[model samples]
Target: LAFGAIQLDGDGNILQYNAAEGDITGRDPKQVIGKNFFKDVAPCTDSPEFYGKFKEGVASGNLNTMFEYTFDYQMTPTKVKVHMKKALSGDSYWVFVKRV
Candidate 1:
């Protein structure tokens, strides 16, 4: 994927994280996969602005959303755009990100 790509389960646990995502977050895929995205992998995004949208999308079945965010995964804030979509065949969400 051109942008950072991540596959997350319904509960926000990471299922997959592509190389782009690892590069962007400075996290190894092995360190993130099977971890809770909002709680464990990226706690900086646990706030309402980021995680809330995810909860609302799952609750309302509306997954086509995009917004700008600052990722502090590396302890240094990095501006980026986030795109979220639900998987066609499963109750999973795909997150795509690009630096802003």
Candidate 2:
């Protein structure tokens, strides 16, 4: 299956929340775009391991990392492998979510 992609800014603002991601989390991309990924869209990731990691990446400009995460705060329990990357083309970050 194809993976979901989310384009986020350095501050965790979601610039693009793809349809594939919506399918995985049962969220509407239309509503999640421009929202804060950690605070608004997925509060489950607002903690140290995730939000803090993102901040660390921004601080160092080294965002290439991978880990497993679960989405269960407000949606059906779903697990995924997350890939975070700093895009070479811009000052933005990429999150690739692949279901396990």
Candidate 3:
């Protein structure tokens, strides 16, 4: 099983990221430990138009959003399942790959 997880502040700062997350993103924990989630690593994360729907669900006190995405990692195609939830202080997300 391969998985990655993170907790982010409302302002998108990286509050926490696990070891598995670092490996999934191909970054060292030291590199991402205290960086901004959107600015430092995933710029796409800042596109509210894309991510806003999920954020809205969280802010509105809904359960969370479960979504699927397909992308290429190192020229190898991959698929991922993601689950996101909101906490009183911030939001948390988990990503896992579906292996055959």
TM-score of each: 0.83, 0.83, 0.59
- For model 1, the stretches where C-alpha displacement exceeds 4 angstroms are none
Q: What is the C-alpha lDDT of each candidate?
A: 0.76, 0.77, 0.54
Tens-digit lDDT string for candidate 1 (1-100): 3467777766888877878766744676667767998888788887778888767788887676788888775657767787888986656888787776
For model 2, what is the alpha-carbon lDDT of residue 2?
Answer: 45
**What is the TM-score of candidate 2?**
0.83
Worst 10 residues of 3 by lDDT: 91-100
- Evaluated at residue 86, the lDDT of candidate 2 is 85
lDDT of 1: 0.76
Model 3 ranges off by over 4 Å = 48-50, 71-77, 88-100
Name the runs in model 2 displaced over 4 angstroms: 24-26, 88-90
Cα misplacement distance, residue 34 of candidate 2 (Å): 2.5
How many residue-pair clashes does candidate 3 contain?
Answer: 0
Clashing pairs in 2: none
The residue-level lDDT of candidate 1 at 31 comes to 74
State candidate 3's TM-score: 0.59
TM-score of 1: 0.83
